[PDB]
Amino acid sequence: SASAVYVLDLKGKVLICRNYRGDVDMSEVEHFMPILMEKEEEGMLSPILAHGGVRFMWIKHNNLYLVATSKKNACVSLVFSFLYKVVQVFSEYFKELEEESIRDNFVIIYELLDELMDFGYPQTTDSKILQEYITQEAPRPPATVTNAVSWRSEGIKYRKNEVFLDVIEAVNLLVSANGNVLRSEIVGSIKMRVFLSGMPELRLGLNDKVLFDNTGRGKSKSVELEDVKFHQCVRLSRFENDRTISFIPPDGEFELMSYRLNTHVKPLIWIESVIEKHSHSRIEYMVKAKSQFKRRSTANNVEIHIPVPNDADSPKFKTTVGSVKWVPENSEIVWSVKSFPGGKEYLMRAHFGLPSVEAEDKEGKPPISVKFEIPYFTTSGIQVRYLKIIEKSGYQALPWVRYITQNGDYQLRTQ
Amino acid sequence: SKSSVIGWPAVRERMRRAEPAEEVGFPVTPQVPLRPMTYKAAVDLSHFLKEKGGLEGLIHSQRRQDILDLWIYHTQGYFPDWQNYTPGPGVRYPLTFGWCYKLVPVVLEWRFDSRLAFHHVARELHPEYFK
């Protein structure tokens, strides 16, 4: 239950404002930015500020503070999911979202905030359907905005019939400095790119553990999906009965399912870092990167960020394979390796100076955080098995898939 | 079934040296298409097991199954869950539509049965799972 969706910017001037209820005054937004500066300059920052009896829910995009006030017992999960869906609608019209798009597209952004929300209750936010009666270039609203299938305008025609999948893994890791592994979870995201003709009914079938157990095949390779979060398009009752994933797809790119499973197997890339930090003199980094994964797959463009001290100087970098740039904007040495085969072990030795007069404040210890990307290689072992195109028209479509492992927050705590 | 000939003694030797009683993650062969071990592929595999020999009357285990399934997946492009059998009680019949061998105890051994391709005996042992 939002009251007034604003768009602020980094100074406190309103790029665009649009109140829905009138239960919050319009000059309450001028009280936002001093309250945020006050709550941030004492460390009590929160997404829910408080100016008397008006609460400021807000998210912070690139330049934008999409503040949306309320007054009552506001449904905060609804307000924040609506703010990130406003961010996604703007970024699907305007390919970046900065101040240079809000002051140029007030023809269409007031129409969007007219359309998305009424009285505080979000009602039509699927952008691929919203591109059909709110344009920057009006007819009747489509029957998609009415009907139960509210994400797919009927009558889409392509010459070819291609369904592109992307079973993109994302290994999380958080290795404590003693050497043991704390949280090693994997967040996959099957991210489709659909190009079909009509109103199809796909039936995606994974190698889900509960499906292989209800069938009777509980001794082969089966991924154990701990929690699965689907898109809207997946009918969830049929998924809850017998683990069948049936969905009428949208047209374009979206995130079909976002699974998450834990893993008690070794990390993929392991970073044994030491630090010879003499006080007032220098520091050394005999960091080695052993690739625990299979010998066949090649970790494209790993970037082992390694946090140096803030004021280090005059570096030296004896590596084995791969360039080292010292990035002092971030105070880290981004040790890049382009082709990093599985089973190898590449060693690096940085060497800095250090200022002789000591610092004034302490700095903290950020983690070594790699940026790896191993294609054709699923860590959890999920295998897509089929994708049944069902269409009343009747045709042979061409499904496709590829496999990527990435990093999630692949961090490793330091000395 | 051309590429399965050169590993037909070698994978069999690694199976027989394996007792019937680092590395992380699962790579996928680039750009080579995938499909389950279908019906006529299973009949061609049964004739390949029948003419070339070396599988009948041999001691069956699960480790042999796993090494053979990973070998088939890495050398032919077929999903490594086609070699599934029923559990303990009864005869360890194959679940797969097209596997014409049944596993009686001697630890198991193969036994040929040319009606497992159509008359699904594992469906007779497991009626509710197959709808």
Binding site: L165, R385, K388 | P33
Partner: peptide, 13 residues
């Protein structure tokens, strides 16, 4: 997307 895809089966009933 620089990488390449792999065709998955249709029916598999």
């Amino acid at each position: 997307t620089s990488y390449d895809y792999c065709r998955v089966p249709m029916e598999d009933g």
